[PDB]
Amino acid sequence: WLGESAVARMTTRAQGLEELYKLWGYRATRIDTMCEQPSTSIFQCQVRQLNWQELQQTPHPLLLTLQHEGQRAYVVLLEVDPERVVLLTGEQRLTFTVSQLMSLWRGEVTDLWPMPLRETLRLGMHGEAIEVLDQLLAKALNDEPLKTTQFNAELMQRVEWFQRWQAMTEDGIAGQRTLARLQHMVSLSEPWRALTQEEQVMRYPEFPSLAPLLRTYPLAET
């Protein structure tokens, strides 16, 4: 595996995704780690091809596919900067330089993120989905939520402010492009940040007790 056989511990995507779900605090089933659509919980799972510039911009951990002379292996990327990536193998925390990463990674990632909002939300609608919209927008904008259950005129102005920041049409409707960007960037909880930032209260590869996945979506009504 060039010189680093430790990185290549997890040999299937399902094994890697089981580990990636633990970073989010969840115990995943065999169905969840198939990464097939439709989703079986509020999480989205997508395989994508990234370049290194794109990988550096990831807003949350990813599963990297490593390839070496006809073999595949899978490792969790926990954090990344221009010089180094921090990898989780299911047994060890490793740091790789850019050179080490590029010798083994050919672009493929599998990305998991929570996406509880999967239907268009617009002015006049109300319900738990609107409260969740309100909370995610405050998190993305780094400011305060309205504490509203109603998609009102002021929430609409906040959708537009997010839309303009993200270079998307500023129609004030939280439709597919707007909710997909919002929920890939931020989540209601990000337990994985506990592993990023002496010595450690919970040392990897140990995890605290995991929760079952959330398998209901918040509703909204017209």
CATH code of the domain in which 15 resides: 3.90.70.10
Domain contains 211: no
Domain contains 216: no
Pick from 59, 61, 22, 76: which is nearest to 202 by CA?
22
- Does 110 lie in the same domain as 26? yes
- Does 59 lie in the same domain as 164? no
- Does 65 lie in the same domain as 155? no
Q: Please report where in the chains the tokens 């390839």 appear, as a residue.
A: 67
Q: How was this structure determined?
A: X-ray
Domain contains 126: yes
Structural domain count of the chain: 2
DSSP string, the chain: -TT-GGGG-B-SHHHHHHHHHHHTTEE--TTGGG--SSPSSSEEEEEEE--HHHHHT-SS-EEEEEEETTEEEEEEEEEE-SSEEEEE-SS-EEEEEHHHHHHHEEEEEEEEEE----S-B-TT-BSHHHHHHHHHHHHHHTS-----SB--HHHHHHHHHHHHHTTS---S-B-HHHHHHHHHH--S--GGGGGT----SS-TT-----EEPP--PPP-B-
- Does 121 lie in the same domain as 62? no
- Does 122 lie in the same domain as 99? no
Q: What are phi and psi of 193, to 5 degrees?
A: -65, -20
HSE (CB half, 13 Å, CA atoms) of 167? 0
- Does 152 lie in the same domain as 85? no
Q: What is the resolution of this structure in A?
A: 1.5
* Interrupted after residues, the chain (C–N over 2.5 Å): 197
The reply to whether omega before 199 is within 30° of 0 (cis) is yes
Look at the chain and count its residues. 222
- Does 150 lie in the same domain as 51? no
CB neighbour list of residue 209: distance below 8 Å, 6 or more residues apart: none
- Does 102 lie in the same domain as 19? yes
Give the residue numbers spanning the domain of 165.
Answer: 116-187
- Does 156 lie in the same domain as 122? yes
Give the separation between CA 166 and CA 26, rounded to whole angstroms: 30
Give the separation between CA 34 and CA 31, rounded to whole angstroms: 6
- Does 105 lie in the same domain as 138? no
Q: In what order do the strands lie in the sheet with 62-68?
A: 43-49, 105-114, 62-68, 71-80, 84-88, 93-97
How many other CB atoms sit within 10 Å of the CB of residue 144?
8
**3 state SS for 91-108:** CCEEEEEHHHHHHHEEEE
- Does 176 lie in the same domain as 92? no
The amino acid present at 76, given as its one-letter code, is: V
